[PDB]
Ligand binder design. Structure first.
Ligand SMILES: [Cl-]
Ligand SMILES: [Cl-]
Ligand SMILES: [Cl-]
Ligand SMILES: [Cl-]
Ligand SMILES: [Cl-]
Ligand SMILES: [Cl-]
Ligand SMILES: [Zn+2]
Ligand SMILES: [Zn+2]
Lengths: 406, 406
């Protein structure tokens, strides 16, 4: 049956209907490469990797854009320190981490510094159209004028709760004047400055996907102000909503507690992989970690603990044992298991807002069958075996993105 | 003793003298990511990886900039094909290839699209200064005026051998008008266009290293026109030579013949690694391939063949066997080998224009000693053994960039 996606705009699961048949344009907010990528951000990027893989298995042609914030968003020549040196250091580490977790590369991976010119044009566009105003070298988005025209700022997060350069405190910066402390700067119509965080993603998303595209993803912390500002920028620039489906991935906790460097309940991705940490009793292969992650729904809070990870590992091994045993299973003239029925149960879970936990459970029905088949307690024809092998590898390696561990 | 570097400007080995004590600024021309990275380009990037590593072992603080040409140099929205999709595909593959060959990441890795704004300013600079002129939306560098002022175009390649928009046929483009066929374009003072290849590297090199920096590297095919144009651009912009030491890596051949897709004498890096090719009789670990490469001097032509690679592999194994056997060697009260003398021979080869073949030969003296030590035919004190272990691992893993193969 057809795919359903939870949409943060409406708070309900919706029939997914693409703007262009057989095609999906998809944008996910990427890392700010001024420090090491956090584990919770890895989960978000892994969740949208799974979603990207699933959209392709279903047969869509998916253009997946995921940006890199290498300029601005500071809220996050040999003797002079170089911002681009830092950017390079954490960009490389970011890609090494994601490669270990077997994430596919996105179709396009634009950088904010790669699109200053496009962002300066959008700022001009919003100034000339009345949605923005220059103030002491910066440019701010006029929230109250945006509202007076009826465009409803806050429709995503559904909130109205809670300096001198701005007409109103809720105005946000599209362009910021560079102070002498700012090394990264660019000439512009308003002096030397650097981009506002939110306008980077609007310039980059619409350039490669259009004024309106199917899916926009990110962590739930981006819902406000970031994604709220992307919506307002897109509606004020193009006169239409930029995104039909807004997807938000949920938090990650450890031992039921929030991940905090200040609390001490903190662990970097590599520390969890290598076991160089005091929360987990061993090292863990990233595919085991990925398996564990996918046992939680991307909109659920994922909690990692030593006992939960060990349980995921035991379940991971059983799955892969069956995967190896399929190539050696014997064949009978009749099948006492219904592979067609299992695949329909597995597939429906997948197109039910990418329900990886339920999908994994249906995979265990096939795992249980493989060990039963091996001991002659069940039988299977050659055609059903070929079908079982194709579907099970496709779910395990292509959709879930798991991989074998020697 | 002190480092000597061959300089293409003078055609001789020169005492290396840095612009700033204990520091090296270093720029190497990077790949054009519109196709798969060629093996010969891998050799060039591997040669400068070795050089980068060697400059650090010697104790210099090295800022290594290596660019990416993701816009322009074409001489090299869901339904519309996307240049940035292609760029992304071959950028990822480029980094995966180099990671397999154990190259370090450069300190900064700028992209041409990341610096359109800086390149537009340099073009203005050269127009206002008389070195360049607008012509039908493009901007061209005036070679004859550059020469009339005495700046000698051609000092690098030492040549003068061998359309309607240009004052003279030797003029080269700093900025090119975009035709409707060009998807990649940018607004500018002269209309919509895209950067000229040569001016990308001048804007990017000087921004992160200064108006004059120590070393500029690249393949020997870049000497003209590319590096000749970088010299002219830097001298016309800044009134001084941009580079004190010009380094050029030489060609790669297979079976004594030129690598050509048209000839059929062609092999991609991954095909050589995986053995999925008809020139080599097996697969080869990239560290073995890297060892083979470093047995040729970076300014020599490297020829790869099945018999040469097998010989390199046999020599690679012997080296690593000794490397493993050092931790188990027994110690005596006296040393019948002079580790101090060997290290001085090994180090002098290194600072003799990065003479990896000679350095590897001196490493085999230490390899020969390790097998002799194991059989009691030679002796060594504990202090000499500790020194031998430190220097030999440092040359093998840190300088040569080799790695163990399980
Ligand atoms: Cl972002
Ligand atoms: Cl703001
Ligand atoms: Cl997840
Ligand atoms: Cl280049
Ligand atoms: Cl030209
Ligand atoms: Cl070499
Ligand atoms: Zn964003
Ligand atoms: Zn270059």
């Amino acid at each position: 049956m057809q795919l359903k996606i939870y949409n943060s705009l409406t708070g309900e699961k919706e029939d997914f209907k693409p703007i262009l048949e057989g095609n999906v344009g998809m944008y996910v907010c990427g890392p700010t490469v001024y420090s090491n990528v956090h584990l919770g951000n890895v989960r978000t990027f892994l969740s949208f990797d799974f979603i990207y893989r699933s959209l392709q298995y279903i047969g869509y042609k998916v253009r997946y854009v995921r940006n890199i914030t290498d300029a601005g968003h500071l809220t996050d020549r040999l003797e002079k320190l170089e911002p681009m040196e830092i950017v390079q250091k954490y960009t490389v580490d970011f890609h090494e981490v994601l490669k270990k977790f077997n994430l596919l590369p996105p179709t396009i991976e634009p950088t904010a510094t790669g699109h200053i010119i496009e962002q300066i044009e959008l700022t001009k566009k919003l100034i000339d159209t009345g949605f923005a105003y220059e103030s002491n070298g910066s440019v701010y988005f006029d929230v109250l004028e945006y509202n007076a025209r009826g465009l409803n700022y806050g429709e995503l997060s559904r909130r109205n709760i809670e300096q001198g350069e701005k007409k109103n405190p809720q105005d946000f910066a599209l362009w910021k004047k560079a102070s002498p402390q700012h090394i990264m700067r660019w000439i512009s119509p308003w002096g030397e400055g650097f981009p506002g965080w939110h306008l980077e993603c609007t310039a980059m998303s619409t350039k490669y996907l259009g004024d309106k595209f199917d899916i926009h993803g990110g962590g739930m912390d981006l819902k406000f102000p970031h994604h709220e500002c992307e919506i307002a920028q897109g509606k004020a620039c193009n006169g239409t909503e930029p995104v039909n489906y807004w997807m938000h991935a949920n938090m990650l906790t450890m031992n039921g507690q929030r991940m905090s460097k200040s609390t001490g309940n903190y662990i970097l991705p590599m520390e969890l992989i290598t076991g160089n940490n005091s929360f987990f009793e061993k090292a863990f292969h990233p595919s085991v970690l990925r398996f564990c992650f996918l046992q939680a729904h991307y909109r659920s809070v994922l909690d990692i603990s030593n006992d939960a990870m060990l349980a995921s590992e035991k379940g991971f091994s059983r799955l892969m044992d069956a995967v190896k045993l399929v190539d050696e299973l014997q064949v009978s003239e009749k099948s006492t298991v219904n592979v067609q029925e299992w695949y329909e149960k597995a597939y429906s879970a997948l197109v039910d807002d990418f329900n990886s936990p339920i999908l994994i459970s249906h995979l265990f029905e096939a795992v249980k069958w493989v060990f039963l088949l091996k001991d002659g307690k069940e039988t299977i024809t050659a055609d059903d075996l070929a079908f079982l092998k194709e579907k099970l590898n496709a779910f395990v390696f292509d959709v879930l993105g798991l991989q074998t561990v020697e």
